[PDB]
Amino acid sequence: MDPSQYASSSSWTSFLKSIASFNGDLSSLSAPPFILSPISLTEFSQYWAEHPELFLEPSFINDDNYKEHCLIDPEVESPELARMLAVTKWFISTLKSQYCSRNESLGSEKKPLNPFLGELFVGKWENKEHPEFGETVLLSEQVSHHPPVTAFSIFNDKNKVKLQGYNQIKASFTKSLMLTVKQFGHTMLDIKDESYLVTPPPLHIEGILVASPFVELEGKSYIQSSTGLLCVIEFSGRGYFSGKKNSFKARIYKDSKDSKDKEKALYTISGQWSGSSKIIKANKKEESRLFYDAARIPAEHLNVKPLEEQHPLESRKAWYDVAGAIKLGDFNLIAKTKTELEETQRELRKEEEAKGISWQRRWFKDFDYSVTPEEGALVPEKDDTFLKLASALNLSTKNAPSGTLVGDKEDRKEDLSSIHWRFQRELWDEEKEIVL
């Protein structure tokens, strides 16, 4: 049918009624074919680096060229600050990819495929037009199905820029049909010997009643550096304080201590993350410069091998039949192909439970950061980067919503675990079957 008839269709009405009895698992919703996306959530990890030049820029900034590299502030006080500005620009650049990609390729936000345990998604940005960049690799793996958790790493060996992180969400519907989404997890970016800890923001999906969903960010995101510098990004927009669609305000401070006083901000960046934003230094409101304009530089999609060469666990290969059925809009075929894959997985899980076997994660392992960790679990090293950055930010190390600070209600939750997925580069180095 035409999108104009989605909202009043029997299919959408039945979907909205299934929401009324939402059991907590989005996979139990009767989402009609027209609102389904043929893309699995394991693919979303690629949204962290669709602007290769911005991802790598911090590695090119040094003591001898930092002022010359900093266009937004040729008077930047230090290379560390120049790099924080670059990392902030990169983070902002990821937002359009993360939260707007489906609206552009599918017509609206849609329900993504719920990955199966063990699903993989790999590719690379060859950066052919820039030999100084080198190849940047993406490894994404579904480390959990119940609940869904995607772990990932994006790395550029040539310039020593590596990123790793994981993501999980907890979603619920309000009485007005707003889908509230709390993200869990975090991402760490290492630029040579300098590190940055990034926390994703909470968000909500609106437009469900009218059958034209879209993401609206809220809350805050943090970027804590090993240099002490901290960037606090606040999201607002329509229906909220600002009233401006996809708006944000980011402030950079000398340290988390100073972030308690907005007047201490070294820079203030404001605008729309899906559009243009300006930057003001200190408090010189008078003078401002363009910080980032999302419309000027198109996202660069990574290179993925042809389907004919993909391994059975690779996302697109595994979901091929379902993706095809979704593109056709065939109600019965979608149910048939999806059930086929998910039932095979059920059988696998039942065999594992009864046979005393556990699925072994491929390139990531779950580290227990608890004071009293599971006896067989891997534990963090003394010089663990997350521990040091979380300490600097006064961030909770528990499995609380992303960005939860020590002392917050979510951190004082009784018997909350502290398990975090970590990339194990050695496992990729000794990978003997998967290739790029």
Ligand X SMILES: CC(C)CCC[C@@H](C)[C@H]1CC[C@H]2[C@@H]3CC=C4C[C@@H](O)CC[C@]4(C)[C@H]3CC[C@]12C
Binding residues for ergosterol are: 98
Contacts of 47 (CB under 8 A, 6+ apart): 94, 97, 98, 101
Which one of 104-112, 278-286, 391-399, 406-414 is the stretch in contact with ligand X (CB under 6 A)? 104-112
Nearer to ligand X, 69 or 338 (CB): 338
Assess 173 for contact with ligand X (CB under 6 A).
Answer: no
- Eight-class DSSP state of 236: E
Which option in Pb ion, ligand X, none does residue 162 bind, with CB closer than 5 to 8 A by kind?
Answer: none
Contacts of 274 (CB under 8 A, 6+ apart): 95, 96, 99, 100, 245, 246, 294
Q: What b/e readout covers 257-270, taking b as 16+ CB neighbours within 10 angstroms?
A: ebbeeeeebbbbbb
Nearer to ligand X, 96 or 316 (CB): 96
Assess 220 for contact with ligand X (CB under 6 A).
Answer: no
Assess 166 for contact with ligand X (CB under 6 A).
Answer: no
Is residue 18 classed exposed, middle or buried when 0-12, 13-18 and 19+ CB atoms within 10 A define those classes? Answer: middle
Measured CA distances, 374 to 114, 250, 382 (Å)? 28, 39, 18
Which option in ligand X, Pb ion, none does residue 91 bind, with CB closer than 5 to 8 A by kind?
Answer: none
Q: How many whole angstroms separate alpha carbon 212 and alpha carbon 209?
A: 8
| Residues 235/248, Cβ–Cβ less than 8 Å | yes
Assess 99 for contact with ligand X (CB under 6 A).
Answer: yes
Assess 212 for contact with ligand X (CB under 6 A).
Answer: no
Nearer to Pb ion, 130 or 238 (CB): 238
- Interface residue with Pb ion among 130, 192, 238, 412 (CB under 5 A) is 238
Which one of 2-10, 208-216, 283-291, 416-424 is the stretch in contact with ligand X (CB under 6 A)? 208-216
Assess 84 for contact with ligand X (CB under 6 A).
Answer: no
Assess 26 for contact with ligand X (CB under 6 A).
Answer: yes
Helix axes 320-328, 331-355, angle to 10 degrees: 160
Query: To 5 degrees, how large is the angle CA 153–CA 159–CA 164?
Result: 15
Assess 169 for contact with ligand X (CB under 6 A).
Answer: yes
Q: How many whole angstroms separate alpha carbon 170 and alpha carbon 172?
A: 7
Residue 334: CB minimum distance to ligand X, A: 15
**Ranges within 346-405 binding Pb ion (CB under 5 A):** 366
Amino acid at 130: H
Q: List residues binding ligand X (CB under 6 A).
A: 26, 35, 41, 44, 47, 98-99, 109-112, 167, 169, 179, 181, 183, 205, 208, 213, 215
Q: Could you list the residues that contact Pb ion (CB under 5 A)?
A: 238-239, 366
